[PDB]
Design a binder for this molecule. Sequence first.
Ligand code: T27
Ligand code: U43
Ligand code: MG
Lengths: 415, 556
Amino acid sequence: IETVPVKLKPGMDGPKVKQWPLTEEKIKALVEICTEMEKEGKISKIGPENPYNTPVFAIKKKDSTKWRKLVDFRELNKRTQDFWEVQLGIPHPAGLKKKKSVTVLDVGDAYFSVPLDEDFRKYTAFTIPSINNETPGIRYQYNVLPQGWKGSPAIFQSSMTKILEPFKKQNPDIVIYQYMDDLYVGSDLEIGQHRTKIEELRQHLLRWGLEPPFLWMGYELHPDKWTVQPIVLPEKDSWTVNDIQKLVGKLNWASQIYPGIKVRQLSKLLRGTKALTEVIPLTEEAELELAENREILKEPVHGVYYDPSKDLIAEIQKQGQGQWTYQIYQEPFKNLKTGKYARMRGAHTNDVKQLTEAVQKITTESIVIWGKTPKFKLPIQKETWETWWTEYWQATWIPEWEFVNTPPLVKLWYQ
Amino acid sequence: MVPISPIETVPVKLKPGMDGPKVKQWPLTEEKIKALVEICTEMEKEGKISKIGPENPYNTPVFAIKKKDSTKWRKLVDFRELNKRTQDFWEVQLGIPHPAGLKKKKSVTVLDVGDAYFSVPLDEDFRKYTAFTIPSINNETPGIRYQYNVLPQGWKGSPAIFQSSMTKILEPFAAQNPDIVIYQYMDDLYVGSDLEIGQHRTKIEELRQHLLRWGLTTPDKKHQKEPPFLWMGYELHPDKWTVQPIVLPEKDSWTVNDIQKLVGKLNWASQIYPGIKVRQLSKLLRGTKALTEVIPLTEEAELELAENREILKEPVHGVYYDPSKDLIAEIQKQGQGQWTYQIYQEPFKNLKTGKYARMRGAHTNDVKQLTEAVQKITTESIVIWGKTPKFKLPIQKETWETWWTEYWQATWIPEWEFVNTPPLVKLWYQLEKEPIVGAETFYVDGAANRETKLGKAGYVTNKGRQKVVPLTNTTNQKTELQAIYLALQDSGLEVNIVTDSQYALGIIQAQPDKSESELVNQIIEQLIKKEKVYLAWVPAHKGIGGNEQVDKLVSA
Ligand SMILES: Cc1cc(/C=C/C#N)cc(C)c1Nc1ccnc(Nc2ccc(C#N)cc2)n1
Ligand SMILES: CNc1ccc(C(F)(F)F)cc1N
Ligand SMILES: [Mg+2]
């Protein structure tokens, strides 16, 4: 009810980010949403003395008919002071990634019950544009904690811990983790029991709330089953020259990750200038070297550790036929997680929708495992991505990304 | 008298850490002083400025400028210094409407709101910073000191605060009259509708009544300005629009500056005149910036110009937007990285046109450029109409499918249909996914000496075919490409090629059909003539036969 003082980082002005073009459908949805938010006192109209801006758009959550406003606070989040006042860190729960079910709840509507520091509100300014700029954009700022701002879970944390005390005491084996607008609730129970406990948890927030438009939803994960991608080599009875060349290439790449990898004996098989499709018998010095490499590749990579002070980096490769491979790391060749997708939802003829859904799944895994989002290296032209990703976004957070313009040769090795 | 609603003032601040201006007043002739005193006395009577005491330490210089061909002086308060120190504001006019997004209107009336401007008060706490001084006659008395009570012309915040104040006044009238559109430009309001003139004239009088709630008067002798409107370089008519006349000059010789102005005119024209081209004319300004330097026009640029003169021979107009109908965008390839497009709803009635130019880059191909043009038109269309047009594109559906399923990047173009109008965009070559049985295998390599720039490129094959070529003034990268070229030149229609060049694979896996490198262009020319090409990569210096042999031959 009383505002926590909030400041930007020293020598840092507010965000002045351009509003990108919005479709008629999204504008109409935002006008209706913001008209109601204004009546409810969550936002207020602002004047021209406020030069700041943060982009806004609208999404449709996974399995929903109703538009949700999404503010892209990435710039404001970078410029907002860090929050270690009341605490010296909220250690990420390492057990969340080990539960048989994790449900993700949109609890952002709760933030709207806490007022925002009067001196900070100006920095949350945003604009609803008009088609063809025919009327002045509608300008508003927040009077309460906004969804998507990094300070909102921080300021609301005290309130959240007390709302959840009865449920935690009564269910002590449940892991509850909050990231931005999401609540992650992991358990080891039968999914039928799980869904009940989840609905139990909703009632605590509806009870305290006295309505949340998207609190009833549930994104169901199962991190216990998340797969990885170790380096595997082919098992063949007939090796062509081309097969052996591909094998020596892959092993040369792997030797940057695993020290003891050797190719000397396999290269020797390709002694001469042979047709690519000619079959080469493995001599046994080569079969041994290959078995030795196979055994090396069954062990973990050496010297791989997570440093919470360093960015996570996520790389993605398009493998074709709806399949995507990815790696998360902080140092080159020290992968913290690798993976592969194929089941990309309703996008069999749309590369960019598939990539956007892969980005969201990888970010979700990263939040669960380390409690922060990775910086993506995306195999797409900037202009193609920027034109379309907002059409397929269903998450309430947004990661950072850069673009890969040169084809990586390593795509072949993750296939 | 009738109470009027006050216009809420906008709170204004100087930038952090800054103080108001303290600028010395220039000496003025006795004649100018007398004119400024008379001018300011009138302004003071009208409430625009007020005399201040000597406490105020701020100052901005004032000048007297003779209105040409007249004995009437006019005052200029030079706020350049206060503007440097005044906060930034939200500027709404950054994006101006494009005529092609406007809707056809039966009537459009103009209303002068120049008097309302000086009804917007200036924030009381900011007025002190606007102080200025009329010098005294012979400098024998204190100068007369004034400050502003209203938005000063020339002050940084006046456009934004005036626009925002008028918008707030107009909002309830627009919201409760959804059968009209209101627009603010300079000191005029433009009001359009589809109503019969009678009802339209009523709305206008109701708008005047609404404005009088704030004491804002509008001249009853209605505005002289009437359709067509000259606005932001366009001509607006009730049911069509165009650009203001585009006249390309006749010239015996052209300077850098003339070519810059010519291209600017062609660019402006290209939004409704289809097919405008500026590539060859723009090439002439490459790198140079000798504004007065003359450049001979290439034969290519003379043809481009002549082609443009013909396009501009007679007037062309666009129609306005009908939201009840689909938007269609059609694109044509023009050559040399140039693309042109038309957006329409009914056949042969364009809303607008435009062009797109290939981005600067080492290697490119038509499919990538078409894709980029589509994204540009998509984004422009969202801005102007709030939705994506349906596309008509010169590429077969099967060509697109082959492209995007095999391209290493994610890529997408929205709903589109093939339009069979040459030049068609096509795939010029596709590499094999598997080694070719029965095709000769060429192991290629090249190397160069970093200091002498001498090198070698060559190949050895499984049939014992071999070639090594000595090269001068070359690099490791060039020799690696030269080796692949030699293998293409000397092989049959089907060929397997083995290289260790990550550089060459990076280029070829990008699937260019045109390059700045003449060597890449030669490789492309050879690829186009083949039936099947499999390109295989191996790591260098690993004892891989064939590769090892030719590496020795070329590194010698
Ligand atoms: C942007 C704009 C500039 C001017 C005027 C600018 C100036 N000078 C006048 C108006 C009314 C508007 N606003 C809108 C909004 C929607 N449709 C239209 N259509 C429209 C506008 C003018 C004419 C005409 N003649 C015909 C149709 N105008
Ligand atoms: C920036 N000018 C402006 C202000 C207010 C309106 C309104 F009619 F929507 F109220 C239209 C315009 N063009
Ligand atoms: Mg070599």
